[PDB]
C-alpha cells in the first residue's frame, strides 16, 4: 500500500537563500526553484521509469531589488511562483513572478560559436587593412555545451497589490495573474496591456472583507478558472458566460470550532486542480479539503494536516506562525496528495486507502536509498515526538510532485530535498 | 575596395545588436561582393542557424532571405535558401515565423514544378510532421502555394498532411490550421472541398477550444463563397447556425463581427430565412460586446437586404430590436448605434423616417453620454437629404 520513500538528494547549505517556490516542468526532467534573493536555479535529471539524480542545469537572477519611488516602498525580488510553459521547441520557457512583475524566461542550450575574422585574429590582434584582399565568411565550430537564460518578455505595472498567483490557460495563448483584489488576463506575447477580468475591490476600503489568496486555470477547459479567498470560499468562473467574470458560476463553501481564530485558520492558502480536472483541492491552515466540482455545498474528502496544533493556536498567533501559507499538490494519478507541516514534517494522504504517513526532511538520514521512517506526534511512547518539542521555525511550505514518477521535491527553509520511491 | 565589405562581414559576429542588425540589412551587398558561388557555399551556411536570436535581427534576416534568389544563382539554385528559412520557421517568436513563412511562399513561385516535389514539398512534410509545434504551426501556411503545381499523387499526400494538422493535439497548431483552412480550400478542386474540407471545417467548428471555434467563422465565409448556393444548406448552414448559438460569447462576437460578410456569401434567400433571425438574437445578446458588434452592422445589414422585402423586414423584424438597443444600459452599445442608425433613413423613406426613425434620433440626442450625442450630430448628412 504505502509508498516506501527513500532519501535521494539534498541541495543547498541567509535570508536570500531561502527557497520560495518549487516546480517540475511538464515532462518532469527539469526542476526549478526560486528563493527570496530573486534567483532561479534549474536542475536537470540525468537521463543516462527514470530515477536519475538532478544536477544544476541553469542559474540566473530572475528579479532584482527595486524601489517604488511613487510610494516610497521597497519591492521584494522574492520569487513567488514559477510556471513552466509547454515545450514549444528545443528551448524551455517558464514564467517567473515577484510581487509586481512577471517575466518570461527562455532557457536554451548552445554548443557552437562563430570563428574566423577578416580584419583581426581571434586574440583581438588587429592587422593593417591595406593587406586585406580576399574576404572570408566566419564558420561555426563546436564548443563546450553551455546553457543560457535570457528574459524575453516583461509583464509589469499591471498590479496595484501583491501578486500571489500565475496560471497558464490550456489554450497555449494566455495566463492569469492574481493580486489581493484583482485578476488580470495576459496574452503570452503581449506586454503592454492586460485584461482585468475579476475585481473584488470595494468602493470604500474601510468595508474590505475579502482578499484573493490563490487563482488557477482548469487544466483542460480553457474557459474555467477558480479563485479562493481569505474567508475560505472558492469561486468557479466561466469565461464563456461573459467577458468579465465578476459573476461566479459556482461557489464552494461549507456551512463547535467557532473560536477567536476561526476567521484566521479558515483562509485558503492554496488551491489546486487535479490532473484529471474533476476534483479540486484547497489547503487551509489545519486541513486539506478535496472538492468535487459538481458539489458546491461540501467537500467530498477532508484531511487533517496537524490536529495537535488546534489547541495551540494561541501560541501560534503570538509568534505569527498562524499566518503561514502552506501549499498542497496532487500526484500524477490523483490518488495521493502531499502537503507540508512544521518541524520539517510533510504529510501524505492516500485517497483510495484513506491512510496517512508523516515523513521528515532531515539530513540525519543523508544516505541515498535509505527508507524514510514514518513519524508519530504525541501530546510519549517509543519513537514518538512530543508536540512541545516541535520546532515551528522549520516549515515545509513548498513541495512539488513529479508529473509522472514517484519523485517529490520537498523544500525546507534552506535545503531542497528530493525523495524517490524504493526500487 | 573590399575593406568596407570586410567590416560588414566581421560585424555579423559583433556583440552590438545594432551593428549586427545593420550588417544583416546589408546582406545583399555582402552577397553581391562575395559572388554567386561563394554565397551558396559560404554565406548561407553561416546564416542557416544563427546563435544570435534577437527578434529584430531574425525578423530582418527572414526578410532578406526572401530576396536572395538572384544572389544565389537564380531559380536554378533557389532551393539553397530553404535551410536558412526552415530554421527561422521554427523559432518561438510568432512574427519571425510569420515572416519566414512569407519568404518561403515568395521563393516557392520561383521553384520549378520538379523542384517543388524534390525540395519544397519535402520541406513542408518535415515541418508538418515535426516534433516541435512551432514547425507544425508554420507548415499550415505553406500548403496553398505548393498544392496547385504538383502532381495528383503529391496532392493527395498534401491533403492528408493538412488533415493531420487539423487534428493536432496542440491548440496552437489547430488554430493555425483553422486560419489557413479557407485559403487551402480555395486551391482545392470542388470535389475535394465537399469531401475533405467540410469534415475538417465541421470538426474545427465544434472544437473544445473557444479560440479554435471562433476561427471557424472566417472559414465559413471562405467556404460559402466556393460552394454552389444549392449546397450551402446541406454543408455550410448547419455549422453557421451552431456558431450563432455558441455558448462562448467570443464565438458569437465573431459571427456578429463578420455578419455582413456572411450575408454576401450565403445570398439573399438564406439571409431572409436564417440570418435575419440570427441577427435579432445577436442584438439581444447577454454580452454587451456582442450587442455592440451587432449594432455596427445594422446599417450595412439592412442595406444589403433584397428590395423584395427590405423595407418590410426592417420595419417588422429589425426596427423593434433597435428600439431596445437605444435604451441599452451599456454606453458602448448605444454609441455604436448612434454612428449608424441615421443611415436607415434613405432605406425607409421620408414617411417611415419621421414616424419610426425620428423618435429614436430625438431619444439618442437627449442621452446623457456625450459620445452618443456627438455620434448622432456627426451623421446628420444622410437624414438631411430625406427629411
Amino acid at each position: 500500500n504505502d509508498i516506501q520513500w527513500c532519501f535521494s538528494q539534498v541541495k543547498g547549505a541567509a535570508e536570500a537563500d531561502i527557497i520560495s517556490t518549487v516546480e517540475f516542468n511538464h515532462s518532469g526532467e527539469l526542476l526549478a526553484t526560486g528563493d527570496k534573493g530573486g534567483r532561479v536555479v534549474i536542475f536537470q535529471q540525468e537521463q543516462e521509469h527514470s530515477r536519475g539524480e538532478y544536477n544544476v542545469y541553469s542559474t540566473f537572477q530572475s528579479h532584482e531589488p527595486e524601489f517604488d519611488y511613487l510610494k516610497s516602498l521597497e519591492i521584494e525580488e522574492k520569487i513567488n511562483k514559477i510556471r513552466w510553459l509547454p515545450q514549444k521547441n528545443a528551448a524551455q520557457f517558464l514564467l517567473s513572478t515577484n510581487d509586481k512583475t512577471i517575466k518570461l524566461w527562455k532557457i536554451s542550450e548552445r554548443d557552437k560559436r562563430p570563428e574566423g575574422y577578416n580584419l583581426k585574429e581571434e586574440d583581438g590582434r588587429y592587422r593593417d587593412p591595406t593587406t586585406v584582399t580576399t574576404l572570408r565568411v566566419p564558420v561555426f565550430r563546436p564548443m563546450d555545451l553551455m546553457v543560457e537564460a535570457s528574459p524575453r518578455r516583461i509583464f509589469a505595472n499591471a498590479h496595484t497589490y501583491h501578486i500571489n498567483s500565475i496560471s497558464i490557460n490550456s489554450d497555449y495563448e494566455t495566463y492569469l495573474s492574481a493580486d489581493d483584489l484583482r485578476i488580470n488576463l495576459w496574452h503570452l506575447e503581449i506586454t503592454d496591456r492586460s485584461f482585468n477580468i475579476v475585481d473584488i475591490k470595494p468602493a470604500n476600503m474601510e468595508e474590505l472583507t475579502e482578499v484573493i489568496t490563490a487563482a488557477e486555470f482548469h487544466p483542460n477547459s480553457c474557459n474555467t478558472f477558480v479563485y479562493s479567498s481569505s474567508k475560505g470560499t472558492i469561486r468557479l468562473c466561466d469565461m464563456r458566460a461573459s467577458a468579465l467574470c465578476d459573476r461566479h458560476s459556482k461557489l464552494f463553501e461549507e456551512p463547535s470550532n467557532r473560536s477567536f481564530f476561526s476567521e484566521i485558520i479558515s483562509s485558503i492558502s492554496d488551491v489546486k486542480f487535479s490532473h484529471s480536472g474533476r476534483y479540486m483541492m484547497t489547503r487551509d491552515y489545519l486541513s486539506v479539503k478535496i472538492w468535487d466540482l459538481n458539489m458546491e455545498n461540501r467537500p467530498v474528502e477532508t484531511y487533517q494536516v496537524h490536529e495537535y496544533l488546534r489547541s495551540k493556536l494561541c501560541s501560534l498567533y503570538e509568534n505569527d506562525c498562524i499566518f503561514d501559507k502552506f501549499e498542497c499538490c496532487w500526484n500524477g494519478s490523483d490518488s495521493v496528495v502531499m502537503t507540508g507541516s512544521y518541524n520539517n514534517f510533510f504529510r501524505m494522504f492516500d485517497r483510495n486507502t484513506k491512510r496517512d504517513i508523516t515523513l521528515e526532511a532531515s539530513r540525519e538520514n543523508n544516505k541515498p536509498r535509505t527508507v524514510l521512517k514514518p513519524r508519530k506526534v504525541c501530546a510519549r511512547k517509543k519513537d514518538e515526538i512530543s508536540v512541545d518539542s516541535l520546532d515551528f521555525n522549520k516549515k515545509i511550505l513548498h513541495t512539488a510532485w513529479h508529473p509522472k514518477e514517484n519523485i517529490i521535491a520537498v523544500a525546507t527553509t534552506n535545503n531542497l530535498y528530493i525523495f524517490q520511491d524504493k526500487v | 575596395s573590399l575593406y568596407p565589405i570586410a567590416v560588414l562581414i566581421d560585424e555579423l559576429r559583433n556583440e552590438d545588436v545594432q551593428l549586427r542588425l545593420n550588417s544583416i540589412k546589408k546582406l545583399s551587398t555582402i552577397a553581391l561582393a562575395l559572388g554567386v558561388e561563394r554565397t551558396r557555399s559560404e554565406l548561407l551556411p553561416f546564416l542557416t542557424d544563427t546563435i544570435y536570436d534577437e527578434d529584430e535581427v531574425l525578423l530582418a534576416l527572414a526578410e532578406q532571405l526572401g530576396t536572395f534568389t538572384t544572389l544565389v544563382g537564380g531559380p536554378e539554385y533557389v532551393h539553397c535558401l530553404l535551410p536558412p528559412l526552415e530554421s527561422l520557421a521554427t523559432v518561438e517568436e510568432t512574427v519571425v515565423r510569420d515572416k519566414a513563412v512569407e519568404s518561403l511562399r515568395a521563393i516557392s513561385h520561383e521553384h520549378s514544378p520538379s523542384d517543388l516535389e524534390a525540395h519544397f514539398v519535402p520541406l513542408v512534410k518535415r515541418l508538418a510532421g515535426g516534433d516541435w509545434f512551432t514547425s507544425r504551426t508554420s507548415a499550415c501556411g505553406l500548403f496553398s502555394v505548393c498544392y496547385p503545381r504538383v502532381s495528383s499523387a503529391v496532392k493527395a499526400e498534401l491533403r492528408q498532411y493538412f488533415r493531420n494538422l487539423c487534428s493536432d493535439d496542440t491548440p496552437m497548431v489547430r488554430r493555425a490550421a483553422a486560419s489557413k483552412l479557407g485559403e487551402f480550400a480555395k486551391v482545392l478542386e470542388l470535389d475535394n472541398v465537399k469531401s475533405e474540407i467540410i469534415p475538417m471545417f465541421s470538426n474545427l467548428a465544434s472544437d473544445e477550444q473557444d479560440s479554435v471555434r471562433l476561427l471557424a467563422v472566417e472559414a465559413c465565409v471562405n467556404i460559402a463563397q466556393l460552394l454552389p448556393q444549392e449546397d450551402l444548406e446541406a454543408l455550410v448552414m448547419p455549422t453557421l447556425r451552431q456558431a450563432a448559438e455558441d455558448k462562448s460569447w467570443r464565438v458569437r462576437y465573431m459571427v456578429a463581427d463578420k455578419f455582413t460578410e456572411l450575408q454576401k456569401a450565403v445570398g439573399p434567400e438564406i439571409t431572409k430565412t436564417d440570418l435575419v433571425p440570427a441577427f435579432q438574437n445577436l442584438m439581444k445578446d447577454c454580452e454587451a460586446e456582442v450587442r455592440a458588434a451587432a449594432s455596427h452592422k445594422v446599417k450595412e445589414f439592412c442595406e444589403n437586404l433584397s428590395a423584395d422585402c427590405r423595407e418590410n423586414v426592417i420595419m417588422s423584424q429589425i426596427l423593434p430590436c433597435i428600439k431596445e438597443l437605444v435604451s441599452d444600459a451599456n454606453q458602448h452599445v448605444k454609441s455604436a448605434l448612434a454612428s449608424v442608425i441615421m443611415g436607415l433613413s434613405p432605406i425607409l423613406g421620408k414617411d417611415n423616417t419621421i414616424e419610426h426613425l425620428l423618435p429614436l434620433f430625438l431619444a439618442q440626442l437627449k442621452d446623457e453620454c456625450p459620445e452618443v450625442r456627438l455620434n448622432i450630430i456627426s451623421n446628420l448628412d444622410c437624414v438631411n437629404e430625406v427629411i
Binding site: N157, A158, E173, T174, R182, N184, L185, H187, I190, D192, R193, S194, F195, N196, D199, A243, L244 | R250, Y253, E289, H332
Partner: peptide, 11 residues
C-alpha cells in the same frame, strides 16, 4: 494598460 474592455487579442 489594464482595462476592463476586452482587448483585441481576446476578442
Amino acid at each position: 494598460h489594464v482595462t476592463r474592455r476586452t482587448p483585441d487579442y481576446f476578442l
